């Protein structure tokens, strides 16, 4: 899977506007799924179906109020909208978290990307964090452009406990479609900013 | 050689408390040896430590920018590096190695090649932890991430006294008896 | 204070020699060589666990030199008070005939990080290399560790000859089995 193909798949996959509906009800809840009534946003009888692992698929339950933030993998499907994870306990009080970050490029000098990304939730999904950082990286470093040098790199989510969680930046499994690329988000993994220390970026070539 | 020397030391230091619960960053500009300029998280801006360093303090403090980068080192620098080395520094353990040899008879217990420096050495006689009449070299830095220390026991021989050593790299206390 | 990591760097004149390094809880995690421009691990194995862009340290050094000039003047040209080094020669392990060992010559509490160390067996100088870089002391002085692997005997009498602009005469240290 020559990186050359990896890259374009990501570029194309990630050139997208996320679904970002705030404080919506959960109509029903199963395992694989979780129904959310995005009625006060899109339209009459519309909604959002978030696909997610069992573990995660069971913490939420009907009537629940939640925040959606997911990258789609299918469209023009009537009244429905489908994503993987992207669900966190709704945020009630306004907040703002300027993220701190280091940008190491194999070859160039250290550079830091502090306060260049702002999260507006206390509890957030790695999806949401992963998305914005990538979008930023794209918008300025063109990390997925056919011409971009970078042959590889990753994201490290630094916690205050002193640990890092990797998130490969050039990884296109299977066919390499938004469905393949965006299904790792099933785990609906989240994080509490009280524990987010900083993030690190690594780019080779 | 009578040519004078003019030195300039810079120390960027990180202090960790309870793992990485709460850290502290501190930058120290040092001309020759006097710490003239400073900067402490607990403070937030550069402070002068000696008149010689004020000119700079006011300067850098005028660049809000550069001052945010330093304010964020407890995160992007300290906790980070702590965690980048974690695996081979804080979690480093290296089993000692004790031997016994006679220096009022003489006894000397040598604890070599261990790490960390937190360690405890004991002198027992048949059935008692004789804590009296024993000099020690204290903990000594070797330069290669390993320490050493010698505890000198002072008694008259006859029986069988032994060195008991317990260090964070071995749950079951290590032992070495000396036939007297 | 459970642990402290220190990024210690200096620049001296007219020697025009810098040094950059990380000190963890006491030891040198690693240092950058201004000569070969290559990060050098105190423990060769560390490199397998982490990397550090050597080029980076040299940048600072550049800056540091400059600060020296700009500070040298500002201080109305006042040099550095030589501060003698307190030598000392311990042993890597309990000496025991023929069984390989190491003589350590711990130089500590000196400040102009400039020194000269010579090893002596019987009397004639002995060479290969083996030494650390100027480690820092909470009082901004220095301590350096020099090494020499020897094969214990009783005939030989080793010597660590420390030369510093502190003592008006070289500093010698004797050592031998028993």
């Amino acid at each position: 899977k020559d990186i050359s193909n990896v890259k374009s798949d990501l570029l194309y996959a990630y050139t997208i506007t996320p679904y970002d509906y705030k404080d919506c009800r959960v109509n029903f809840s199963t395992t694989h799924t979780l129904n959310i009534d995005t009625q006060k946003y899109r339209g009459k009888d519309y909604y959002i179906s978030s696909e997610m692992s069992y573990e995660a698929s069971q913490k939420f339950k009907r009537d629940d109020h939640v925040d959606v933030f997911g990258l789609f993998y299918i469209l023009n499907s009537h009244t429905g909208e489908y994503i993987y994870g992207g669900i966190t306990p709704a945020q009630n009080n306004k907040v703002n978290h300027k993220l701190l970050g280091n940008l190491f490029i194999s070859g160039e000098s250290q550079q830091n990307l502090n306060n260049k990304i702002i999260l507006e939730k206390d509890i957030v999904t790695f999806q949401e964090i992963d998305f914005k950082i990538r979008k930023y990286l794209m918008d300025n470093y063109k990390i997925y452009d056919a011409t971009s040098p970078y042959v590889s790199g990753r994201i490290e989510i630094g916690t205050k406990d002193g640990k890092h969680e990797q998130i490969d930046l050039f990884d296109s499994p299977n066919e390499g479609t938004r469905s393949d690329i965006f299904a790792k988000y099933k785990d609906n993994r989240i994080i509490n900013m009280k524990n987010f220390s900083h993030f690190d970026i690594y780019l080779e070539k | 050689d009578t040519r004078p020397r003019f030195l300039q030391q810079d120390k960027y230091e990180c202090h960790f408390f309870n793992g990485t619960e709460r850290v502290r960053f501190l930058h120290r500009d040092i001309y020759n040896q006097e710490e003239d300029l400073r900067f402490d998280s607990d403070v937030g801006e550069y402070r002068a430590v000696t008149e010689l360093g004020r000119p700079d303090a006011e300067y850098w403090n005028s660049q809000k920018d550069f001052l945010e980068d330093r304010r964020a080192a407890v995160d992007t620098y300290c906790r980070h590096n702590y965690g980048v080395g974690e695996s081979f520094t804080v979690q480093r353990r290296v089993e000692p190695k004790v031997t016994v040899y006679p220096a009022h008879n003489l006894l000397v217990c040598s604890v070599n090649g261990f790490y960390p420096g937190s360690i405890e050495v004991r002198w027992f006689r048949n059935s008692q932890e004789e804590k009296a009449g024993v000099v020690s070299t204290g903990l000594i830095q070797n330069g290669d991430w390993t320490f050493q220390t010698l505890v000198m026991l002072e008694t008259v021989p006859r029986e069988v006294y032994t060195c008991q050593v317990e260090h964070p790299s071995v749950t079951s206390p290590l032992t070495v008896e000396w036939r007297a | 204070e459970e642990h402290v990591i220190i990024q210690a760097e200096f620049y001296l004149n007219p020697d025009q020699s810098g040094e950059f390094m990380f000190d963890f809880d006491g030891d040198e995690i690693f240092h950058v060589d201004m000569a070969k421009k290559e990060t050098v691990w105190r423990l060769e194995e560390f490199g397998r666990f982490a990397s550090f862009e050597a080029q980076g340290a040299l940048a600072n050094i550049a800056v540091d030199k400059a600060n020296l000039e700009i500070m040298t003047k500002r201080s109305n040209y006042t040099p550095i008070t030589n501060v003698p080094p307190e030598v000392t020669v311990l042993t890597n392990s309990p000496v025991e005939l023929r069984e390989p060992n190491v003589l350590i010559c711990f130089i500590d509490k000196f400040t102009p990080p400039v020194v000269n160390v010579t090893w002596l067996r019987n009397g004639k100088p002995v060479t290969g290399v083996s030494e650390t870089v100027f480690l820092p002391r909470e009082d901004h002085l220095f301590r350096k560790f020099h090494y020499l692997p020897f094969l214990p005997s009783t005939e030989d009498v080793y010597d660590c000859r420390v030369e510093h602009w502190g003592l008006d005469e070289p500093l010698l240290k004797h050592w031998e089995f028993d």
Partner: peptide
């Protein structure tokens, strides 16, 4: 692999 980060001196 990981990278030790140094405080850039301005």
């Amino acid at each position: 692999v990981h990278f030790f980060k140094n405080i850039v001196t301005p």
